[PDB]
Structure 1
Amino acid sequence: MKELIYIEEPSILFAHGQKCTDPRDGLALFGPLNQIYGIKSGVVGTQKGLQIFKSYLDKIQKPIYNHNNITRPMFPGFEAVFGCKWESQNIVFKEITKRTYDLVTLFNDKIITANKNDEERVDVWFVIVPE
């Protein structure tokens, strides 16, 4: 019989300097490290894709439950956890109405033109790809 040594599970620090092991519990307890004031979401997709993203963004705000909450922690809600606003009413939307190259080019050129020409600042562009 060979002995199995133990490496202690490391703890990741969080806001207020509180260190925990699971990402989920530390986030839902103390919140993230740095405060960003919000997420100005940009959405590049069809109108149906924008509607789907908006509905999911509304659903994120309220708590959403796993089937086994002990095995996998719940989501309290985006504002509860991260302390910043990621509302679906502040979305910068860019509608879309070698095949891989031009399919990438569509979303790409949309994003470059939005980031260059448009005044609306976007924190992160949510490319809602169709199916």
Structure 2
Amino acid sequence: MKELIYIEEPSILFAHGQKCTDPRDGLALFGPLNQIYGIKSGVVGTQKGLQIFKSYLDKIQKPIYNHNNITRPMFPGFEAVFGCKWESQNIVFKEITKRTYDLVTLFNDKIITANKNDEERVDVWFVIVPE
């Protein structure tokens, strides 16, 4: 019989210097290390894509349950866990109305003009691709 040695699971820092194992619990308990003040989301997609992103963002803002919460923890809502504003009413939306290259170029030019021309500041561009 061969000995299976044990490697203890390491713990990862969180807010206030506390340590936990699962991110899904350390975040819900204490929250992330550094503070950003909010996320100005930019969305590059169709109108239906913008509506779907807005609806899911509003759903995110409120707590959402798993089917089995013991194995996979709940989500207490974005503001509860990160303490940061990511509201759906602060969206910078860029409507879109070798095929791989052209499909890339559409979103690429939209994002480049947005980040260059437009004045509204966006921290992360949520490219809501269609299906």
Which category describes the TM-score, using the shorter chain as reference length? Answer: over 0.9
- For 1:51 and 1:2, the matched residues in 2 are separated by 58
3-state DSSP class of the match of 1:26?
helix
Matches of 1:23 and 1:35, distance apart in 2:
17
How far 1:34 moved relative to its partner? Answer: 0.3
How far the C-alpha of 1:30 sits from its partner, in A, is: 0.1
What aligned pairs does 1:23-38 form with structure 2 within 5 A after superposition? Answer: 23-38=23-38
The CA distance in 1 between the partners of 2:108 and 2:102, in whole Å, is 9
| Cα deviation, residue 98, structure 1 | 0.1
What does residue 20 of structure 2 align with? 20
Alpha-carbon distance in 2 for matches of 1:74, 1:32: 17
Task: Name segments (4+ residues, structure 1) moved above 2 Å.
Answer: none
Deviations 1:13-72 (A, max 9, x none): 100000000000000000000000000000000000000000000000100000000000
State the identity as a percent: 100
Gaps of 5+ in 1: none
Over aligned residues, Cα RMSD in angstroms?
0.3
**Could you tell me which residue of structure 2 aligns to residue 2 of structure 1?**
2
Report the secondary structure of 2:109's partner residue.
helix
Q: How many residues align?
A: 131
Q: Is the partner of 2:10 in helix, strand or coil?
A: coil
Q: Which residue of 2 aligns with 1:91?
A: 91
* Displacement of 1:114: 0.1
Paired with 1:80 and 1:43, the residues of 2 have a C-alpha distance of 23
Using the TM superposition, give the Cα deviation of residue 130 of structure 1 relative to its aligned residue in structure 2, in angstroms. 0.3
TM-score, length of structure 1 as denominator length:
1.00
Query: Secondary structure at the residue paired with 1:97?
Result: coil
Q: Taking structure 2 as the reference length, what is the TM-score of the superposition?
A: 1.00
Query: Distance in 1 between the 2:61 and 2:98 partners?
Result: 40
What SS class does the counterpart of residue 3 from structure 1 fall into?
Answer: strand
Counterpart CA distance in 1 for 2:112 and 2:18 is 40
Residue number in structure 2 paired with 1:69: 69
2:63 and 2:119 map into 1 onto residues whose CA distance is 33
- Matched residues in 2 for 1:61 and 1:112: separation? 29
